[PDB]
């Protein structure tokens, strides 16, 4: 029923949002398998095997059986280390995305409530301006019963008439498309939403363009993402420059085999040489292993890295011209709106003055004819793009918000002065 | 020439549907490697080594060449086993894509069929108001040769008539660029396509509005779609689950092998010792393995499939909607042009008797041909709505089949009685 | 300041095109890492191990430590070589994708650079349009002053005019937004621009549109690139038919090693059966494979890469159609420029003799100043839509260029004296 009161219902399950949630959730989990490498492994495994010879190991075949614990861990390994700073990098930019999608929602909630309310103005307007049509049809009907005018005149107030009967539908139609769309974003119908007050709405001047321009630089989200990517590019650089370096891993164990000599020759070997033996091992080891070359791989991977990190660069620097531009189209549009508005607000006070003076004025003499109706299709058209300009101004003061990084629920708090008079989202 | 026509021959050469195919039969495919790992696997191999020792085993030498042929089979695995569900499901998840995309091309043909039809009323009416000026700069231009009328009327019809002629080109113009666009879609050009039949109509009431939601409901591909990724999400948490089991794998073996050796100090005392040994081996064995602690990895990965499912839930949830969002202004719209067909047929009528009875307002001086001037562009207006919203009302009734998700060839040979009149795509 | 000089600051600091290039000399570089494996891999290793034997094994412990130099070396591996010559593929067609946006650069700046122009001339005219309106303004309220008019004209005078006042703001914010559009892509602010001139301008027709396609069909870049995906997709075929085939290794390797019994058992007195070995080792040695079947997974995937490459046969179908349509599109384009040209210069001689036969019929007192106001507004409309035709004939040369493939830097300089007269971009 009020922008606010609407945002608060579309926040709390706005499936966008919420899918963006469980990225951003997913993304720190994947922290933990991230860290797994760097913690102990252990595995139970048993093996059981039956050969059988043949050939000078003719008549002795075997069959043996064995089960282990094995314990392994990764004492230094510079790769695994960098994975995980790699996950916490990459959890980093997700949270910031995901603060982004937030802003998102308030803009677009917003707009969608901003256009519902445009979309009730204009079918308003075509219907004051059908009656407004009518009026001079029905007055002309009368005129011509009696003499006085011919059908060229009744023709040319029917036609107008007919014309704006079809120009209603799609208006119409327009605002039940309006509801239809703010449903999705909210997830529930609004008979009635609260409507601009006139009384209590002024239009502020923004801070100078370039305060502005600076604070962007600190707090725009768009930007601080890029700046964190590059810093991933940056990082990985260093995972490809790991390749070079020594890696040493602790790996324990206990267990057991027994291996079983039965057969022709093996039915007694010598004096009991067949090894019919139970061994049973609980040993601790270590493994040292360093590259010296691999056909070029580390080193292509490592200009590969480099030039990915140039990528980064000039996006960053993308993100910033964009950043850069949208600080100051979205300034320019207030600086034109304001501009609108005080316009088209002199605009209507000067249409109302050839309604006041040439409409209510011409009951005797004077100009008949089209000059009749543009009297009022004038002071229309300039109520439609003063109240037009007027939500363009509102949506121009989040755009600029958002711009800037700081964009939340307060904002559209401070509005509540704005809106006040609930009006009905249904053609009545 | 008819539409179904024009869509039989665009069915079976459009390269974007039968890229999609292709992809529903790899996507198929794959279920077969996907199966593979739970199947046999066989292979030969052989090796050779020569080593020269030193040290305390310095003074010998080894020749070994071996040669082997390996079977290995798996026992059980789960994971193995999701890996085929998963494809399966895969592969079930493109067949819903592909279907989908079968309905676009029907939706796409449709609209770029309208618009070339569409591009041909602008034309032909731009065409019928372009000689409608014309004879009124005639009939003015030849009223001055007498001297009956300034000048300023001479040069006033020319300035009108010549913004004509400039609407001509680019309307001519947007006519072979519609064509264009219908070429690329089917493949071939086209010299006549059937129009509208402008008598025998076919304004129906859509079902009511709830039904369409309750059909939309179960039979939508979208939502479909969205359904069985959500139900693919919760297979992968299951896959996940799978790293905590044990396996069994079966290994059996044929394989021959042999040592000879050579060197200064190579025997040893009685015996004749270090002696070469002709190994053949038949060999058949078992693979028992259970992990137990991997440093938290698969309890991190089961954390992650569950958040990716929580992310496909709010993705379904978000496919509806969507659908809700579409069913209900496919409704309104359907609705709008029922209304609006009827409006404009009405304000036709209204426009039509402008010019009849005014047929006669510069046969005397009722109204200065000025008047009757830019009346003539009413007339064509009103006219121009009702081709304009005749067309939009048939594309707004595919698009509620597409809702309802049972768009077929059946929707497309109804409109053949729609269609019949034969007209120009190149006229002169 | 003129469109040749713009684009020099653009293109040499451009970062959409700048992370282009980083990704195509990435993607360069990445073939020392696809011809890596087929190079020698070199690496040292160290191995301790301590182990104790409970039960039969006897209460018999050891050390043991081993250090070795190894190189492996691919004797043959056909998928190995695939794998490079995939990878130069892939290089190649990220440097057409390179040659693709080294020609999206010229496209945008031109077209940025037009808007601003446009920007201006929009404005232009709309100003000079509010001092038309004015002028009649001026003379009604001294035609009032001494009472010759109704009040009545005074407000369609009025009315009208702040209505102009109003799109004069919108006007002049579509400039900045324009200037800010342009800096985005170029990096910098421009306070003058080189604009057209009306003498000294070009209309040359178009080349046959078959002899367009036929210079199309071979150096237009989308196709191009289409051709090296396809080609492209038949090199990953025999990729997926390498997994069949023979392979061989060989294997070298310098190292010692060195195992010592401690435990009761092996030291005391017998019975003289286990001691300890320092060995060293010269070794050189290959290893042969194949594969018999491996569950029917290489067929599947063969299977699956012969459908991917009627997906790539179907694409370039798809980008054939593209290219076909836009040659065509851009043809019928130039065409409807310059007869909306010719049309246009002949609308505005026919709106200037519509207010110069009329201008002269003021002087002297004949007609409606009404209808010299609604006269006025089409008397600048022609030149307001001449201009414009006039700028959009120049962007459809650069298109026919873009489908051609062959748009480079000189079709710039050929724009050079086409636009000579410097103008403001800030008007105050
Ligand atoms: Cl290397
Ligand atoms: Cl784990
Ligand atoms: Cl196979
Ligand atoms: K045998
Ligand atoms: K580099
Ligand atoms: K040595």
Same mark, same amino acid.
């Given at each position: 029923?009020?922008?606010?009161?609407?945002?608060?219902?579309?926040?709390?399950?706005?499936?966008?949002?919420?899918?963006?949630?469980?990225?951003?959730?997913?993304?720190?989990?994947?922290?933990?398998?991230?860290?797994?490498?760097?913690?102990?492994?252990? !595995?139970?495994?048993?093996? *059981?095997?039956?050969?059988? !010879?043949?050939?000078?190991?003719?008549?002795?075949?075997?069959?043996?059986?064995?089960?282990?614990?094995?314990?392994?861990?990764?004492?230094?390994?510079?790769?695994?280390?960098?994975?995980?700073?790699?996950?916490?990098?990459?959890?980093?930019?997700?949270?910031?995305?995901?603060?982004?999608?937030?802003?998102?929602?308030?803009?677009?909630?917003?707009?969608?409530?901003?256009?519902?309310?445009?979309?009730? $103005?204009?079918?308003?307007?075509?219907?004051?301006?059908?009656?407004?049509?009518?009026?001079?049809?029905?007055?002309?009907?009368?005129?011509?019963?009696?003499?006085?005018?011919?059908?060229?005149?009744?023709?040319?107030?029917?036609?107008? *008439?007919?014309?704006? @009967?079809?120009?209603?539908?799609?208006?119409?139609?327009? @605002?039940?498309?309006?509801?239809?769309?703010?449903?999705?974003?909210?997830?529930?119908?609004?008979?009635? @939403?609260?409507? @601009?007050?006139?009384?209590?709405?002024?239009? $502020?001047?923004?801070?100078?363009?370039?305060?502005?321009?600076?604070?962007?630089?600190?707090?725009?989200?768009?930007?601080?993402?890029?700046?964190?990517?590059?810093?991933?590019?940056?990082?990985?650089?260093?995972?490809?420059?790991?390749?070079?370096?020594?890696?040493?891993?602790?790996?324990? =164990?206990?267990?057991?085999?027994?291996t079983s000599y039965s057969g022709s020759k093996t039915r007694g070997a010598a004096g009991t040489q067949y090894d019919d033996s139970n061994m049973g091992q609980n040993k601790v080891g270590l493994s040292f292993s360093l590259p010296i070359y691999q056909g070029g791989?580390?080193?292509?991977?490592?200009?590969?890295?480099?030039?990915?990190?140039? !990528?980064? =660069?000039?996006?960053?620097?993308?993100?910033?011209?964009?950043?850069?531009?949208?600080?100051? =189209?979205?300034?320019?549009?207030?600086?034109?709106?304001?501009?609108?508005?005080?316009?088209?607000?002199?605009?209507?006070?000067?249409?109302?003055?050839?309604?006041?003076?040439?409409?209510?004025?011409?009951?005797?003499?004077?100009?008949?004819?089209?000059?009749?109706?543009?009297?009022?299709?004038?002071?229309?058209?300039?109520?439609?793009?003063?109240?037009?300009?007027?939500?363009?101004?509102?949506?121009?003061?989040?755009?600029?918000? =958002?711009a800037l990084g700081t964009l939340n629920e307060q904002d559209l708090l401070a509005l509540n002065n704005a809106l006040s008079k609930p009006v009905s989202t249904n053609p009545e």
């Amino acid at each position: 029923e009020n922008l606010m009161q609407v945002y608060q219902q579309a926040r709390l399950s706005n499936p966008e949002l919420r899918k963006s949630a469980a990225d951003r959730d997913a993304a720190f989990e994947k922290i933990n398998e991230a860290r797994s490498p760097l913690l102990p492994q252990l !595995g139970l495994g048993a093996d *059981y095997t039956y050969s059988n !010879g043949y050939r000078d190991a003719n008549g002795i075949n075997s069959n043996a059986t064995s089960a282990s614990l094995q314990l392994t861990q990764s004492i230094f390994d510079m790769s695994k280390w960098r994975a995980l700073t790699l996950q916490e990098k990459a959890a980093g930019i997700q949270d910031v995305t995901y603060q982004t999608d937030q802003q998102t929602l308030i803009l677009n909630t917003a707009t969608a409530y901003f256009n519902v309310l445009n979309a009730i $103005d204009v079918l308003s307007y075509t219907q004051a301006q059908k009656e407004a049509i009518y009026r001079q049809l029905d007055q002309t009907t009368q005129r011509f019963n009696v003499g006085l005018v011919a059908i060229t005149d009744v023709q040319n107030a029917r036609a107008q *008439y007919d014309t704006v @009967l079809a120009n209603e539908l799609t208006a119409r139609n327009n @605002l039940d498309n309006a509801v239809e769309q703010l449903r999705q974003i909210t997830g529930n119908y609004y008979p009635e @939403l609260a409507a @601009l007050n006139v009384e209590n709405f002024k239009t $502020d001047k923004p801070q100078p363009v370039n305060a502005l321009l600076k604070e962007a630089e600190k707090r725009n989200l768009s930007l601080l993402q890029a700046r964190l990517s590059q810093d991933l590019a940056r990082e990985q650089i260093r995972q490809a420059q790991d390749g070079h370096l020594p890696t040493l891993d602790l790996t324990a =164990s206990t267990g057991i085999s027994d291996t079983s000599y039965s057969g022709s020759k093996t039915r007694g070997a010598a004096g009991t040489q067949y090894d019919d033996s139970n061994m049973g091992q609980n040993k601790v080891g270590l493994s040292f292993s360093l590259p010296i070359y691999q056909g070029g791989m580390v080193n292509s991977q490592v200009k590969q890295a480099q030039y990915n990190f140039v !990528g980064a =660069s000039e996006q960053l620097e993308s993100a910033h011209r964009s950043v850069v531009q949208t600080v100051r =189209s979205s300034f320019n549009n207030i600086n034109a709106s304001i501009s609108s508005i005080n316009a088209y607000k002199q605009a209507v006070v000067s249409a109302q003055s050839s309604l006041d003076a040439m409409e209510a004025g011409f009951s005797v003499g004077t100009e008949t004819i089209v000059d009749v109706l543009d009297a009022t299709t004038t002071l229309y058209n300039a109520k439609q793009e003063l109240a037009n300009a007027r939500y363009n101004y509102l949506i121009n003061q989040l755009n600029i918000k =958002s711009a800037l990084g700081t964009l939340n629920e307060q904002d559209l708090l401070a509005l509540n002065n704005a809106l006040s008079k609930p009006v009905s989202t249904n053609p009545e």
